């Protein structure tokens, strides 16, 4: 369960990410690809090199999914439902990989939002990303 | 450990810039706030009731300094991380009974602190070199279980 | 999300555990204490030796919480709400420990229910226990 | 590894009773059904669409036999688990890119299969000796990451 404080911090930090949301998503993915190379196997057809249009394209799509989760934070399961089906059924993404990407998303915000990344906001962001990850792994059949 | 010259270079140069009197306590404090169960191991530390109360706790700051001390000791010895941490392994594994997953958590928290303090300078390849380091340390610190 | 098949398998297996539920709970705890000694530190005041009345007493209380979760499988968060507060706030139980106990609970059923522990029932039981564990770790503040 | 004579005794005696032609495939099949994402690594194995379809798959059964082969090799070498599995580590880590957490999962699944087949004979202390073994193997098999 996400606390009213948590929703407030996540909203505030996403508001401060602003129009960089997409670029931030791209950077999180690259951080993940470099730091945890096992994750690369889900994207064999992507060019994963620095400045890849596909990575960038994916960074925006992933970031948009997160803002949609934020905007509907009280019913994430419904909002992320199609995405949950995709990640668990079709792609068969390992639940561990959600922890690795979540960490890298935290690192990315930390690296871009010096004022916003307080211990509290960090804690709230972490629970948000765990919540999103729980929904995205809810459909293992 | 699998550190390349370029990875060694990214780590050491950044580490030279690290404020070793504060980054250690910044990381422990964040661990205590983000993963509150870890507070179970620090019940003697005093006021841990709010984020501000945790970060401003001199015992946390003092103890994190010791923690960061151990990482710096790890950085001079990536050939023998197992032997450097053996005593700390005994303590955390046999005496404290800390689940080793928490070692990876604090390592990840450190990485977040580094990103936060260094910004654009903590590049994705710089993060990559540091994940190998904290992984290496977490695994050595967990040797007494393996 | 637990599937209608999952609810059916879990119900069936718990029905077959029958009045051994308590004894099974005691055995799961002992299995956990022996296999993963770190978990013992939450029970410093228990006698953890074989045949401990306290372990047994706890085995029944834990087993009763699980049957209550089964009986209300469609609203576990509400049913396990007080227990969630206890485990996360008061005891500060490490989320990892729920995986260790869940595994041992699976081992215990496996060891007592040869006919019931089919690959499907094993999968459903595993998701049930992950669900219960998610609820019990929902209140980290 | 930290195996005592009594622990060694529990493991070996039980292991002598293991049907090595089926228990291996029983465990892999269960892994594929319980943790369906692992099926990603076995897309070439054919029909994996139902539990019955997975357990009755001759390629799964054949491949699990090989898996169990490696455990039995582990059981004769708890002095050097790292070196015994080094080749398998290279394969799973550098070639297959299997997250090591899955190594612990299959180990736990094996333990469930053992409990299932042996019942009251797989006592809590017998399980304890076996958790040290599968942990040991999972960690050696994951050496190429560490
Ligand atoms: C917060 C966590 C995540 C979010 C919000 C997210 C969101 C998304 C979105 C919005 C898409 C696009 C769907 C479409 O274009 O139809 C997608 C696709 C995809 N995702 Fe993620 N995802 C997450 C975690 C992960 C992780 C951890 C992995 C693997 C390590 C992963 C692997 C993939 C792959 C392989 C695709 C398909 C890309 C392609 O084939 O073009 N996702 N995800
Ligand atoms: C990479 C991870 C870690 C490192 C490098 C590390 C390092 C250290 C160091 C250097 C000390 C001081 C020992 C001394 O005074 O001789 C210490 C003590 C201690 N650590 Fe950590 N630690 C780590 C993880 C953890 C975690 C995750 C916890 C709990 C959640 C923990 C709990 C404690 C406690 C309770 C003490 C004080 C025990 C005593 O004074 O006997 N440690 N650690
Ligand atoms: C399916 C998972 C679990 C269930 C259903 C469960 C259920 C319960 C129940 C019903 C109680 C009794 C509450 C009372 O008597 O007021 C309890 C207490 C307790 N639990 Fe659990 N629990 C679970 C997991 C865990 C784990 C994984 C740990 C630690 C490794 C743990 C540690 C404790 C402790 C220390 C107590 C208090 C015992 C005492 O002080 O007398 N629990 N739990
Ligand atoms: C304790 C854990 C494990 C052990 C002991 C083990 C053992 C083995 C063995 C003995 C082989 C045959 C290699 C050969 O033919 O030379 C193999 C191959 C293979 N393993 Fe595993 N394995 C483990 C875990 C896993 C897991 C968890 C996965 C995936 C989820 C996996 C995926 C594969 C695949 C895809 C192959 C075939 C690759 C090829 O033929 O090149 N392994 N493993």
XYZ file of C-alpha atoms and ligand atoms in Angstrom:
746
model
C 0.000 0.000 0.000
C 1.283 3.466 -0.983
C 0.899 6.150 1.705
C -0.645 9.601 1.045
C 2.856 10.971 1.732
C 4.243 8.517 -0.879
C 1.750 9.611 -3.556
C 2.630 13.232 -2.818
C 6.390 12.631 -3.087
C 6.134 10.562 -6.290
C 3.823 13.162 -7.894
C 6.202 15.942 -6.866
C 9.271 14.176 -8.252
C 7.585 13.219 -11.525
C 6.390 16.816 -11.857
C 10.016 17.912 -11.462
C 11.270 15.371 -14.032
C 9.019 17.259 -16.406
C 9.507 16.901 -20.145
C 12.769 14.974 -19.592
C 10.686 11.859 -18.711
C 11.500 10.159 -22.015
C 15.235 10.990 -21.927
C 15.331 9.741 -18.360
C 13.723 6.434 -19.367
C 16.302 5.955 -22.101
C 19.122 6.562 -19.617
C 17.671 4.108 -17.077
C 17.574 1.347 -19.712
C 21.185 2.009 -20.752
C 22.248 2.010 -17.128
C 20.516 -1.357 -16.751
C 22.045 -2.758 -19.942
C 25.558 -1.759 -18.849
C 25.250 -2.641 -15.146
C 23.338 -5.901 -15.533
C 24.156 -7.344 -18.958
C 21.828 -10.356 -18.494
C 18.905 -8.012 -19.078
C 20.151 -7.393 -22.632
C 18.811 -10.732 -23.895
C 15.212 -9.440 -23.976
C 16.326 -6.904 -26.559
C 18.466 -8.918 -29.021
C 17.046 -6.954 -31.973
C 17.591 -3.549 -30.392
C 20.805 -1.732 -30.963
C 21.803 -1.149 -27.330
C 24.761 1.148 -28.081
C 24.812 4.709 -26.741
C 22.413 7.021 -28.571
C 20.283 4.230 -30.074
C 17.059 5.495 -31.468
C 15.357 2.315 -30.420
C 16.546 2.587 -26.847
C 15.425 6.195 -26.840
C 12.129 5.216 -28.357
C 11.746 2.664 -25.672
C 12.812 5.022 -22.953
C 9.868 7.277 -23.757
C 7.337 4.446 -23.958
C 8.493 3.080 -20.605
C 8.495 6.566 -19.017
C 4.981 7.204 -20.361
C 3.822 3.940 -18.747
C 5.201 5.118 -15.400
C 3.487 8.567 -15.660
C 0.264 6.744 -16.471
C 0.795 4.665 -13.330
C 1.405 7.850 -11.309
C -1.697 9.518 -12.750
C -3.739 6.499 -11.683
C -1.740 5.530 -8.618
C -4.877 4.318 -6.810
C -5.698 1.729 -9.520
C -2.342 0.727 -11.040
C -3.520 -2.892 -11.650
C -6.186 -1.629 -14.074
C -3.919 0.974 -15.712
C -0.956 -1.405 -16.100
C -3.134 -4.399 -17.035
C -2.201 -4.714 -20.706
C 1.452 -4.102 -19.843
C 1.267 -6.801 -17.177
C -0.032 -9.280 -19.778
C 2.763 -8.309 -22.163
C 5.639 -8.568 -19.659
C 4.569 -11.816 -17.951
C 2.850 -13.822 -20.755
C 4.507 -12.759 -24.010
C 7.990 -11.639 -23.059
C 8.308 -13.879 -19.999
C 10.350 -11.253 -18.113
C 12.166 -12.533 -15.000
C 10.820 -10.865 -11.796
C 14.423 -10.083 -10.759
C 14.782 -7.762 -13.756
C 12.139 -5.417 -12.414
C 14.349 -4.876 -9.322
C 17.388 -4.138 -11.538
C 15.489 -1.601 -13.719
C 13.823 -0.027 -10.636
C 17.234 0.528 -9.043
C 18.526 2.110 -12.298
C 15.465 4.355 -12.505
C 16.248 5.501 -8.965
C 19.892 6.108 -9.935
C 18.752 8.138 -12.958
C 16.482 10.421 -10.894
C 19.199 10.770 -8.271
C 21.606 11.826 -11.033
C 19.241 14.458 -12.455
C 17.224 15.714 -9.471
C 19.657 16.780 -6.664
C 17.035 18.786 -4.732
C 14.148 16.296 -5.162
C 16.007 13.095 -4.236
C 15.688 13.390 -0.423
C 15.735 10.248 1.765
C 11.915 10.416 2.054
C 11.329 10.913 -1.698
C 13.830 8.096 -2.372
C 11.805 5.816 -0.046
C 8.505 6.766 -1.710
C 9.914 6.371 -5.205
C 11.262 2.952 -4.258
C 7.807 1.768 -3.041
C 6.144 3.165 -6.186
C 8.538 1.200 -8.388
C 8.067 -1.962 -6.300
C 4.299 -1.504 -6.661
C 4.578 -1.053 -10.442
C 6.836 -4.118 -10.585
C 4.295 -6.164 -8.570
C 1.548 -5.331 -11.061
C 3.808 -6.105 -14.050
C 4.576 -9.576 -12.613
C 1.006 -10.343 -11.506
C 0.132 -12.385 -14.598
C 2.566 -15.351 -14.525
C 0.421 -18.275 -15.664
C 36.928 -9.681 -9.607
C 36.220 -8.702 -13.219
C 37.437 -5.067 -13.183
C 39.040 -3.721 -16.397
C 41.600 -0.864 -16.434
C 38.878 1.529 -17.693
C 36.493 0.340 -14.967
C 39.273 0.679 -12.353
C 39.844 4.210 -13.700
C 36.183 5.251 -13.403
C 35.970 3.972 -9.820
C 39.209 5.383 -8.391
C 38.884 8.882 -9.872
C 35.343 9.261 -8.598
C 36.287 7.765 -5.268
C 39.004 10.370 -4.827
C 36.247 12.995 -4.896
C 34.129 11.235 -2.250
C 33.570 13.086 1.040
C 34.415 10.038 3.193
C 33.149 11.739 6.360
C 29.548 12.016 5.154
C 28.793 9.677 2.221
C 29.030 6.639 4.510
C 26.381 8.007 6.884
C 24.280 9.324 4.032
C 24.071 5.699 2.749
C 23.340 3.953 6.083
C 20.686 6.577 6.882
C 19.022 6.029 3.509
C 19.076 2.235 4.079
C 17.324 2.756 7.420
C 14.656 4.984 5.879
C 14.130 3.008 2.604
C 14.323 -0.487 4.093
C 12.948 0.164 7.636
C 13.332 -3.462 8.762
C 17.089 -2.890 8.911
C 16.411 -0.569 11.877
C 15.914 -3.795 13.822
C 19.719 -4.040 13.938
C 20.174 -0.464 15.254
C 17.679 -0.287 18.127
C 20.454 1.070 20.370
C 21.126 4.067 18.108
C 18.395 6.292 19.534
C 15.858 8.370 17.616
C 15.051 6.600 14.336
C 11.399 7.733 14.092
C 11.565 10.062 11.069
C 13.767 10.449 7.969
C 15.220 13.740 9.312
C 15.737 12.045 12.704
C 17.639 9.183 11.034
C 19.897 11.272 8.797
C 20.723 13.690 11.610
C 21.614 10.907 14.015
C 25.322 11.207 14.973
C 25.585 7.471 15.690
C 24.276 6.662 12.205
C 26.701 9.168 10.707
C 29.551 7.805 12.847
C 28.685 4.196 11.994
C 28.316 4.842 8.264
C 31.777 6.346 8.325
C 33.044 2.945 9.481
C 30.976 1.257 6.773
C 32.512 3.518 4.107
C 35.893 2.758 5.659
C 35.373 -0.909 4.750
C 34.428 -0.102 1.117
C 37.625 1.962 0.692
C 39.478 -1.041 2.074
C 37.644 -3.134 -0.525
C 38.759 -0.764 -3.317
C 42.461 -1.304 -2.563
C 41.973 -5.087 -2.612
C 39.775 -6.331 -5.490
C 42.256 -9.226 -5.835
C 41.356 -10.543 -2.379
C 37.928 -9.214 -1.396
C 37.140 -12.523 0.333
C 40.060 -12.249 2.759
C 39.729 -8.511 3.403
C 36.093 -8.908 4.520
C 36.440 -12.281 6.300
C 36.349 -10.719 9.771
C 33.372 -8.525 8.800
C 31.736 -11.631 7.285
C 32.088 -13.514 10.596
C 30.584 -10.569 12.467
C 27.557 -9.934 10.180
C 26.848 -13.595 9.390
C 27.701 -15.549 12.595
C 27.220 -12.800 15.197
C 24.587 -10.422 13.803
C 22.633 -12.837 11.528
C 21.952 -10.152 8.902
C 20.420 -11.649 5.785
C 23.003 -11.113 2.979
C 20.369 -9.595 0.661
C 20.721 -6.534 2.859
C 24.385 -6.304 1.800
C 23.274 -5.883 -1.830
C 20.631 -3.340 -0.715
C 23.183 -1.086 1.065
C 25.468 -1.425 -1.998
C 22.669 -0.257 -4.258
C 21.885 2.525 -1.774
C 25.541 3.644 -1.901
C 25.319 3.731 -5.675
C 22.230 5.945 -5.389
C 24.153 8.256 -3.025
C 27.030 8.445 -5.493
C 24.682 9.303 -8.391
C 23.019 11.914 -6.203
C 26.288 13.614 -5.187
C 28.016 13.361 -8.570
C 25.171 13.759 -11.089
C 26.130 13.718 -14.781
C 29.593 12.537 -13.633
C 28.132 9.202 -12.460
C 27.660 8.034 -16.040
C 26.093 4.704 -17.007
C 29.567 3.148 -17.517
C 30.708 4.670 -14.214
C 27.681 3.092 -12.538
C 28.538 -0.218 -14.211
C 32.040 -0.321 -12.701
C 30.582 0.492 -9.274
C 27.871 -2.235 -9.449
C 30.651 -4.791 -9.933
C 32.342 -3.379 -6.866
C 29.356 -3.423 -4.513
C 28.340 -6.839 -5.813
C 31.878 -8.035 -5.147
C 31.815 -6.671 -1.602
C 28.318 -7.964 -0.821
C 29.404 -11.453 -1.952
C 32.627 -11.451 0.092
C 30.772 -10.127 3.138
C 28.385 -13.060 2.681
C 31.142 -15.708 2.391
C 30.461 -17.125 5.895
C 27.061 -18.328 4.602
C 28.341 -19.869 1.337
C -3.727 -12.138 -9.129
C -4.773 -15.681 -8.140
C -6.543 -17.664 -10.880
C -9.849 -19.537 -10.339
C -7.797 -22.713 -10.890
C -5.348 -21.508 -8.185
C -8.123 -20.888 -5.637
C -9.509 -24.344 -6.387
C -6.132 -26.065 -5.945
C -5.262 -24.196 -2.727
C -8.729 -24.916 -1.264
C -8.397 -28.579 -2.226
C -4.941 -28.935 -0.681
C -5.884 -27.123 2.529
C -8.979 -29.324 2.757
C -6.678 -32.348 2.505
C -4.284 -30.994 5.164
C -7.316 -31.164 7.410
C -6.876 -31.108 11.171
C -3.084 -31.476 10.790
C -2.896 -27.744 9.863
C -1.384 -26.800 13.223
C 1.147 -29.670 13.288
C 2.117 -28.769 9.747
C 2.718 -25.134 10.729
C 4.962 -26.224 13.580
C 6.992 -28.409 11.215
C 7.376 -25.608 8.649
C 8.805 -23.281 11.316
C 11.286 -25.924 12.504
C 12.304 -26.603 8.931
C 12.902 -22.866 8.527
C 14.820 -22.588 11.802
C 17.118 -25.477 10.850
C 17.551 -24.636 7.150
C 17.907 -20.870 7.500
C 19.265 -20.134 10.977
C 19.177 -16.336 10.455
C 15.412 -16.505 10.876
C 15.898 -17.687 14.472
C 16.724 -14.181 15.722
C 13.054 -13.108 15.627
C 12.349 -15.777 18.220
C 15.153 -15.371 20.802
C 12.721 -16.082 23.660
C 11.229 -19.178 22.056
C 12.730 -22.530 22.742
C 13.353 -23.641 19.148
C 14.357 -27.227 19.995
C 12.364 -30.155 18.609
C 8.986 -30.588 20.298
C 8.841 -27.057 21.746
C 5.432 -26.164 22.978
C 5.974 -22.606 21.902
C 6.932 -23.576 18.381
C 3.905 -25.835 18.273
C 1.752 -23.083 19.657
C 3.062 -20.833 16.995
C 2.656 -23.405 14.292
C -1.083 -23.485 14.933
C -1.471 -19.704 15.063
C 0.414 -19.328 11.784
C -1.565 -22.171 10.148
C -4.838 -20.601 11.327
C -3.783 -17.303 9.710
C -3.215 -19.114 6.411
C -6.639 -20.892 6.545
C -8.205 -17.510 7.240
C -6.415 -16.187 4.155
C -7.707 -19.150 2.117
C -11.257 -18.653 3.397
C -11.083 -15.026 2.284
C -8.764 -15.462 -0.676
C -10.505 -12.663 -2.603
C -9.764 -10.047 0.106
C -6.532 -11.190 1.786
C -5.382 -7.561 2.396
C -8.384 -6.981 4.681
C -8.156 -10.395 6.380
C -4.382 -10.209 6.932
C -4.421 -6.493 7.813
C -3.643 -6.734 11.526
C -1.015 -9.390 10.816
C 0.540 -7.137 8.183
C 0.834 -4.332 10.760
C 2.416 -6.727 13.251
C 5.001 -8.245 10.880
C 6.122 -5.013 9.173
C 5.790 -2.340 11.928
C 6.360 -4.127 15.237
C 8.556 -7.095 14.424
C 10.264 -5.515 11.413
C 10.453 -8.866 9.582
C 12.809 -8.943 6.570
C 10.881 -9.547 3.286
C 13.377 -12.313 2.398
C 12.170 -14.358 5.374
C 8.715 -14.719 3.884
C 10.319 -16.500 0.885
C 12.241 -18.853 3.222
C 9.119 -19.756 5.280
C 6.984 -20.094 2.104
C 9.482 -22.570 0.656
C 9.451 -24.563 3.942
C 5.650 -24.575 3.981
C 5.764 -26.014 0.464
C 8.308 -28.634 1.584
C 6.060 -29.561 4.524
C 2.975 -30.102 2.330
C 5.079 -32.020 -0.176
C 6.280 -34.250 2.674
C 2.759 -34.967 3.953
C 0.524 -34.839 0.865
C 1.985 -37.172 -1.847
C -1.227 -37.280 -3.921
C -2.113 -33.562 -3.582
C 1.311 -32.080 -4.380
C 1.048 -32.186 -8.207
C 3.030 -29.705 -10.346
C -0.141 -27.597 -10.805
C -1.072 -27.601 -7.090
C 2.575 -26.784 -6.267
C 2.384 -23.783 -8.647
C -0.913 -22.586 -7.143
C 0.303 -23.045 -3.584
C 3.444 -21.088 -4.421
C 1.404 -18.115 -5.773
C -0.899 -18.222 -2.725
C 2.093 -18.009 -0.391
C 3.664 -15.206 -2.452
C 0.335 -13.355 -2.264
C 0.130 -13.829 1.519
C 3.750 -12.677 1.805
C 2.990 -9.557 -0.290
C 0.171 -8.579 2.065
C 2.320 -9.239 5.161
C 5.045 -6.904 3.809
C 2.662 -4.201 2.558
C 3.021 -1.991 5.637
C 6.734 -1.025 5.713
C 6.672 2.617 6.798
C 31.366 -25.891 2.232
C 30.059 -26.214 5.796
C 28.906 -29.870 5.761
C 29.267 -31.855 9.022
C 29.652 -35.670 9.131
C 25.992 -35.986 10.235
C 24.884 -33.661 7.423
C 27.046 -35.608 4.930
C 25.370 -38.780 6.251
C 21.815 -37.473 5.777
C 22.553 -36.364 2.207
C 24.401 -39.430 0.902
C 22.016 -42.048 2.317
C 18.989 -40.289 0.884
C 20.778 -39.683 -2.380
C 21.460 -43.394 -2.739
C 17.686 -43.894 -2.828
C 17.128 -41.263 -5.539
C 15.732 -42.479 -8.878
C 18.302 -40.542 -10.947
C 16.419 -41.217 -14.190
C 13.294 -39.306 -13.148
C 13.931 -36.929 -10.218
C 16.010 -34.644 -12.451
C 13.171 -34.227 -14.959
C 10.574 -34.015 -12.221
C 12.481 -30.943 -10.897
C 13.064 -29.148 -14.235
C 9.413 -29.721 -15.187
C 8.243 -28.251 -11.883
C 10.543 -25.222 -12.395
C 8.969 -24.662 -15.817
C 5.436 -24.872 -14.427
C 6.030 -22.918 -11.151
C 8.306 -20.226 -12.579
C 6.969 -19.994 -16.189
C 9.461 -17.305 -17.244
C 12.165 -19.978 -17.236
C 10.383 -21.500 -20.262
C 11.965 -18.626 -22.181
C 15.187 -20.668 -22.126
C 13.509 -23.846 -23.471
C 11.517 -22.563 -26.454
C 13.058 -25.325 -28.592
C 11.739 -28.110 -26.346
C 8.287 -28.324 -27.922
C 4.932 -28.485 -26.148
C 5.177 -26.533 -22.881
C 1.551 -25.296 -22.814
C 0.182 -27.234 -19.821
C 1.596 -28.798 -16.633
C 0.893 -32.333 -17.958
C 2.456 -31.315 -21.299
C 5.602 -30.096 -19.506
C 6.099 -33.080 -17.202
C 5.467 -35.562 -20.010
C 7.930 -33.871 -22.334
C 10.790 -36.307 -23.132
C 13.231 -33.451 -23.782
C 12.496 -31.977 -20.347
C 12.915 -35.408 -18.781
C 16.112 -36.013 -20.773
C 17.498 -32.573 -19.908
C 16.656 -32.825 -16.207
C 18.569 -36.078 -16.137
C 21.644 -34.089 -17.187
C 20.847 -31.470 -14.549
C 20.640 -34.163 -11.851
C 23.885 -35.559 -13.241
C 25.583 -32.275 -12.304
C 24.185 -32.319 -8.727
C 25.534 -35.863 -8.192
C 28.857 -34.545 -9.447
C 28.492 -31.736 -6.902
C 27.876 -34.268 -4.098
C 31.217 -36.019 -4.681
C 33.046 -32.673 -4.599
C 31.875 -30.333 -1.804
C 35.566 -29.446 -1.308
C 35.766 -27.901 -4.780
C 32.260 -26.974 -5.933
C 33.645 -23.860 -7.647
C 35.949 -25.833 -9.946
C 33.512 -28.670 -10.657
C 30.858 -26.227 -11.928
C 33.201 -23.729 -13.642
C 32.362 -24.988 -17.136
C 28.624 -24.997 -16.328
C 29.063 -21.502 -14.843
C 30.600 -20.233 -18.108
C 27.736 -21.757 -20.085
C 24.817 -20.458 -17.943
C 26.364 -17.069 -17.132
C 28.343 -16.037 -20.268
C 26.452 -18.014 -22.928
C 22.865 -18.368 -21.686
C 22.608 -15.234 -19.464
C 20.363 -16.967 -16.910
C 19.869 -14.810 -13.842
C 21.516 -16.723 -10.933
C 18.395 -16.368 -8.755
C 16.976 -19.082 -10.979
C 19.753 -21.408 -9.764
C 18.448 -21.043 -6.192
C 14.867 -21.560 -7.459
C 15.681 -24.910 -9.157
C 17.590 -25.935 -5.991
C 14.543 -25.201 -3.874
C 12.383 -27.026 -6.430
C 14.672 -30.079 -6.158
C 14.276 -29.964 -2.398
C 10.491 -29.942 -2.852
C 10.789 -32.976 -5.162
C 12.893 -34.786 -2.573
C 10.365 -34.057 0.206
C 7.582 -35.221 -2.090
C 9.266 -38.533 -2.985
C 10.662 -39.296 0.474
C 8.020 -37.909 2.860
C 8.656 -38.387 6.590
C 12.198 -39.485 5.613
C 13.031 -35.946 4.424
C 13.179 -34.673 7.997
C 13.829 -31.044 8.941
C 17.528 -31.822 9.626
C 17.700 -33.771 6.355
C 16.256 -30.739 4.570
C 18.822 -28.542 6.327
C 21.777 -30.540 4.974
C 20.273 -30.389 1.474
C 19.679 -26.587 1.569
C 23.406 -26.149 2.212
C 24.076 -28.329 -0.798
C 21.795 -26.571 -3.280
C 22.926 -23.191 -1.977
C 26.516 -24.315 -2.469
C 25.818 -25.432 -6.032
C 23.790 -22.341 -6.948
C 26.669 -20.143 -5.721
C 29.359 -22.069 -7.620
C 27.218 -22.092 -10.764
C 26.995 -18.310 -10.370
C 30.766 -17.786 -9.921
C 31.203 -16.290 -13.431
C 29.109 -13.299 -12.272
C 30.904 -12.759 -8.932
C 8.784 -0.220 -14.398
C 9.037 -1.277 -15.171
C 8.605 -1.406 -16.656
C 7.738 -0.653 -17.376
C 6.881 0.543 -16.914
C 7.688 -1.164 -18.733
C 6.893 -0.646 -19.758
C 6.944 -1.109 -21.074
C 6.233 -0.530 -22.189
C 5.329 0.721 -22.087
C 6.499 -1.259 -23.290
C 5.958 -0.955 -24.704
C 4.762 -1.831 -25.063
C 4.493 -1.660 -26.540
O 5.243 -0.880 -27.195
O 3.542 -2.304 -27.064
C 7.407 -2.346 -22.942
C 7.928 -3.322 -23.806
C 8.993 -4.201 -23.523
N 9.622 -4.434 -22.292
Fe 9.220 -3.214 -20.552
N 8.571 -2.243 -18.794
C 9.161 -2.425 -17.536
C 10.104 -3.400 -17.166
C 10.767 -4.240 -18.087
C 11.919 -5.066 -17.788
C 12.525 -5.130 -16.365
C 12.286 -5.739 -18.910
C 13.442 -6.741 -19.158
C 14.562 -6.789 -18.428
C 11.406 -5.345 -19.988
C 11.473 -5.846 -21.292
C 10.656 -5.385 -22.344
C 10.742 -5.826 -23.712
C 11.726 -6.870 -24.275
C 9.655 -5.068 -24.480
C 9.362 -5.209 -25.987
C 10.340 -4.326 -26.744
C 10.274 -4.705 -28.197
O 10.215 -5.928 -28.489
O 10.273 -3.790 -29.058
N 10.502 -4.434 -19.445
N 7.648 -2.212 -21.575
C 28.315 -3.828 2.235
C 27.641 -3.933 3.388
C 28.206 -3.654 4.813
C 29.440 -3.247 5.197
C 30.673 -2.924 4.303
C 29.441 -3.144 6.651
C 30.501 -2.757 7.451
C 30.501 -2.692 8.837
C 31.585 -2.230 9.680
C 32.936 -1.720 9.140
C 31.194 -2.332 10.970
C 32.004 -1.961 12.240
C 32.578 -3.219 12.880
C 33.555 -2.866 13.979
O 33.297 -1.899 14.739
O 34.602 -3.554 14.093
C 29.843 -2.865 10.995
C 29.077 -3.111 12.127
C 27.715 -3.379 12.179
N 26.889 -3.661 11.087
Fe 27.542 -3.454 9.109
N 28.182 -3.501 7.114
C 27.400 -3.817 6.017
C 26.076 -4.218 6.058
C 25.237 -4.238 7.158
C 23.776 -4.316 7.130
C 22.945 -4.378 5.821
C 23.343 -4.322 8.412
C 21.897 -4.369 8.979
C 20.786 -4.203 8.252
C 24.517 -4.234 9.276
C 24.506 -4.202 10.655
C 25.566 -3.892 11.479
C 25.473 -3.767 12.914
C 24.207 -3.940 13.789
C 26.897 -3.418 13.381
C 27.339 -3.177 14.839
C 27.547 -4.540 15.495
C 28.554 -4.473 16.616
O 28.978 -3.349 17.011
O 28.939 -5.568 17.103
N 25.645 -4.188 8.481
N 29.469 -3.070 9.677
C 2.863 -16.919 5.644
C 3.654 -16.203 6.442
C 3.316 -15.824 7.909
C 2.141 -15.912 8.578
C 0.766 -16.382 8.062
C 2.342 -15.449 9.940
C 1.350 -15.386 10.920
C 1.605 -15.023 12.244
C 0.641 -15.057 13.319
C -0.820 -15.538 13.159
C 1.237 -14.609 14.441
C 0.559 -14.515 15.825
C 0.092 -13.099 16.143
C -0.290 -13.057 17.605
O -0.173 -14.120 18.280
O -0.703 -11.970 18.096
C 2.624 -14.268 14.148
C 3.581 -13.773 15.048
C 4.971 -13.692 14.825
N 5.670 -13.892 13.627
Fe 4.704 -14.667 11.853
N 3.687 -15.095 10.054
C 4.325 -15.313 8.826
C 5.677 -15.085 8.512
C 6.665 -14.782 9.473
C 8.095 -14.796 9.237
C 8.685 -15.121 7.843
C 8.737 -14.452 10.384
C 10.250 -14.318 10.697
C 11.214 -14.948 10.018
C 7.748 -14.238 11.416
C 8.040 -13.853 12.729
C 7.062 -13.730 13.737
C 7.330 -13.404 15.114
C 8.715 -13.132 15.734
C 5.973 -13.368 15.823
C 5.753 -13.059 17.317
C 5.991 -14.338 18.103
C 6.096 -13.971 19.558
O 6.755 -12.944 19.865
O 5.519 -14.699 20.405
N 6.506 -14.450 10.821
N 2.801 -14.538 12.791
C 21.489 -25.727 -10.060
C 21.057 -25.262 -11.240
C 21.412 -25.841 -12.642
C 22.186 -26.902 -12.978
C 22.953 -27.875 -12.035
C 22.191 -27.006 -14.431
C 22.854 -27.954 -15.190
C 22.876 -28.026 -16.575
C 23.517 -29.050 -17.376
C 24.284 -30.249 -16.784
C 23.319 -28.755 -18.680
C 23.810 -29.550 -19.919
C 25.041 -28.879 -20.514
C 25.672 -29.756 -21.575
O 24.928 -30.396 -22.360
O 26.927 -29.817 -21.632
C 22.542 -27.530 -18.758
C 22.118 -26.897 -19.918
C 21.178 -25.880 -20.027
N 20.629 -25.151 -18.967
Fe 20.947 -25.673 -16.966
N 21.404 -25.983 -14.945
C 20.910 -25.252 -13.878
C 20.078 -24.150 -13.972
C 19.461 -23.656 -15.107
C 18.325 -22.734 -15.143
C 17.634 -22.175 -13.871
C 18.036 -22.492 -16.442
C 16.921 -21.612 -17.072
C 15.894 -21.082 -16.396
C 18.971 -23.266 -17.254
C 19.003 -23.305 -18.633
C 19.713 -24.191 -19.415
C 19.628 -24.258 -20.853
C 18.746 -23.386 -21.781
C 20.593 -25.385 -21.263
C 20.873 -25.860 -22.703
C 21.871 -24.889 -23.330
C 22.695 -25.552 -24.406
O 22.393 -26.716 -24.798
O 23.671 -24.900 -24.859
N 19.820 -23.955 -16.412
N 22.302 -27.125 -17.455
